[PDB]
Amino acid sequence: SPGIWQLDCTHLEGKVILVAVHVASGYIEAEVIPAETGQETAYFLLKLAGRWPVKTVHTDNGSNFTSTTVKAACWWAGIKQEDGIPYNPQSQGVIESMNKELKKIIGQVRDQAEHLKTAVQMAVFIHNHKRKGYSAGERIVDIIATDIQ
Amino acid sequence: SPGIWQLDCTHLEGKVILVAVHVASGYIEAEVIPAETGQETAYFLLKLAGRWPVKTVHTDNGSNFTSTTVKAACWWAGIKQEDGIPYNPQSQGVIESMNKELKKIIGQVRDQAEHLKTAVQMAVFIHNHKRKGYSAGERIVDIIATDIQ
Ligand SMILES: C=CCN(Cc1ccccc1C(=O)NCC1CCC1)Cc1ccc2c(c1C(=O)O)OC[C@H](CCC(=O)O)O2
Ligand SMILES: C=CCN(Cc1ccccc1C(=O)NCC1CCC1)Cc1ccc2c(c1C(=O)O)OC[C@H](CCC(=O)O)O2
Numbered sequence: 001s002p003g004i005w006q007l008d009c010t011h012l013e014g015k016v017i018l019v020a021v022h023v024a025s026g027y028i029e030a031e032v033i034p035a036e037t038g039q040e041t042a043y044f045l046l047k048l049a050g051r052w053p054v055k056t057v058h059t060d061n062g063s064n065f066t067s068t069t070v071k072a073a074c075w076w077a078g079i080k081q082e083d084g085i086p087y088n089p090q091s092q093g094v095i096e097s098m099n100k101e102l103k104k105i106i107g108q109v110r111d112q113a114e115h116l117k118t119a120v121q122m123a124v125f126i127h128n129h130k131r132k133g134y135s136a137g138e139r140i141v142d143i144i145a146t147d148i149q
Numbered sequence: 150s151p152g153i154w155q156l157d158c159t160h161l162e163g164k165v166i167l168v169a170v171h172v173a174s175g176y177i178e179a180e181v182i183p184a185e186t187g188q189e190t191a192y193f194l195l196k197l198a199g200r201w202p203v204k205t206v207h208t209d210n211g212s213n214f215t216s217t218t219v220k221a222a223c224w225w226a227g228i229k230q231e232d233g234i235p236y237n238p239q240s241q242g243v244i245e246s247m248n249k250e251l252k253k254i255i256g257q258v259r260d261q262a263e264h265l266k267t268a269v270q271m272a273v274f275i276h277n278h279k280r281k282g283y284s285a286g287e288r289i290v291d292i293i294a295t296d297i298q
């Protein structure tokens with residue numbers, strides 16, 4: 001569980017927001033891209049895995065699961081690439097709610113930036129710092145530190 | 150010191166590599182940009198502070214210290230923006246050595262990607278995972294978790 005992440009792709013303003021969620025904590029990273037491609041996904045995972053100890057990624061769709069570019073990045077970064085089938089139905093709901101939450105935050109900050117990417121990074125900040133009490137940022141660090149010890 | 154970061158800018162292939170170093174751990178994040186501008190620096194800090202609890206940033210030069218765009222991002226993200234004067238001369242040496250190390254790693258991976266940005270992210274990965282025995286990635290998480298507790 002310390003090492004398990006889930007990919008998630010959502011759309012706004014004719015652009016794609018690619019999100020990785022640390023399952024156990026709810027901590028996220030995100031970026032705006034013109035379109036989801038294998039190359040964009042591969043690069044995003046390479047970034048993520050240099051920053052956090054990513055053991056397993058549940059891909060967001062079959063195209064990213066299939067993509068040899070994505071598989072190559074997962075190989076490079078030592079990530080187990082897995083499907084994203086919601087064997088637990090709770091997971092669909094969790095991601096749906098998360099996408100709705102993020103879009104709400106982006107709306108709340110949208111006038112504070114010209115570019116969507118800026119607003120998305122503001123939303124990442126607010127999401128990760130929000131106390132639910134601990135924040136997602138606190139939880140991911142505690143979970144991983146506990147694992148290291 | 151859990152919240153103290155240092156900016157560092159280095160050049161390769163006619164491009165700029167912007168680096169943030171977590172001082173106590175040596176953990177890094179980095180990006181390739183066409184040129185250092187206040188806007189590029191501001192966006193980079195916004196990303197960083199959404200991902201780690203950034204309390205203080207020692208800016209890499211006087212232009213980024215002065216920049217009202219950089220100050221705006223530091224205001225937004227709750228970061229204390231400070232100068233980067235090496236009152237401790239060991240700071241110069243540490244950064245210079247870090248730049249040399251990163252460039253060495255980039256060279257070792259350079260043929261594994263067409264684009265410099267990919268090679269830089271590979272270098273970030275290798276640097277953060279390298280055991281020196283703990284890695285910088287382990288050190289940052291331990292330092293921050295101890296602080297939360
Ligand atoms: C078909 C993929 C292209 N490329 C093939 C390649 C080209 C030359 C040498 C080796 C390899 C190779 O297969 N290397 C092993 C893989 C394992 C991790 C690298 C690798 C790559 C992937 C994603 C990227 C890249 C790059 C790049 O070549 O730099 O560049 C930035 C781009 C940014 C996101 C965006 O713009 O979509 O994401
Ligand atoms: C002079 C800065 C331009 N901008 C002014 C602005 C424009 C409209 C509304 C508010 C504000 C405003 O001052 N907001 C408060 C600040 C506090 C954090 C945002 C803000 C900004 C900064 C860096 C960026 C941006 C953007 C943007 O407007 O989206 O866009 C992506 C760009 C990517 C890096 C690159 O390409 O250089 O980094």
Ligand SMILES: [Cl-]
Nearest residue numbers: 137200201202
């Ligand atoms: Cl945080």
Ligand SMILES: [Cl-]
Nearest residue numbers: 052053277286
């Ligand atoms: Cl790591």
